[PDB]
Design a binder for this molecule. Structure first.
Ligand SMILES: [Cl-]
Ligand SMILES: [Cl-]
Ligand SMILES: [Cl-]
Ligand SMILES: [Cl-]
Ligand SMILES: [Cl-]
Ligand code: NA
Ligand code: NA
Lengths: 16, 16, 16, 16, 16, 16, 16, 16, 16, 16, 16, 16, 16, 16, 16, 16
């Protein structure tokens, strides 16, 4: 799976 | 809001 | 075009 | 009450 | 770029 | 309306 | 001394 | 004279 | 983390 | 200050 | 050369 | 160990 | 434009 | 408790 | 800071 | 004639 990144603060992984 | 990042050059934020 | 980044592990670009 | 401010990005209030 | 600030509520940045 | 801030000292608002 | 800021409305200093 | 504020990083005064 | 602000003069961040 | 980034996993900021 | 990245806010390159 | 990132063009890890 | 809704807490609009 | 929703602008909870 | 330019003759900087 | 411009500091004209 791909992991994208976003600032949510902390930088989190969004796993697809 | 989440902030994604993209290379547009320079790296930019994209706010959601 | 925009390039997003994703961890595929190595970091890859995703071009749009 | 007092409202303080912090950078979180976005600036948020903190109410006391 | 300079970033000014304004209460719009929430405090927001104005980028120049 | 936007409220900007300035030191006039004390901090005042400038409303627009 | 440090001076912090709070919305009390006016913005006031808090002196430490 | 009025002093406004901007992020330039560091927050700077702009004096008018 | 949260970043507060204080006059130290110039404004500085305070990271928590 | 400049903020660099590293994986420590999750991404974290490194302030300089 | 290698290009590192830092948040300065805009993301900037540092070329080595 | 910390992993930093650099554009070398692919993005590579730098392992410390 | 379409305005979607999401819990971010507080419910926000997202405007498209 | 039950939480209803109203536009007040922003969408708010109403707790019962 | 930003430096704009104007003909004043001779071309001058205007610093902000 | 044509007047080009160069930074010499100050911006100067170069007349051709
Ligand atoms: Cl999944
Ligand atoms: Cl709170
Ligand atoms: Cl910390
Ligand atoms: Cl430091
Ligand atoms: Cl001539
Ligand atoms: Na890149
Ligand atoms: Na810097």
């Amino acid at each position: 799976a791909l992991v994208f990144f976003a600032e949510d603060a902390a930088i989190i992984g969004l796993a697809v």
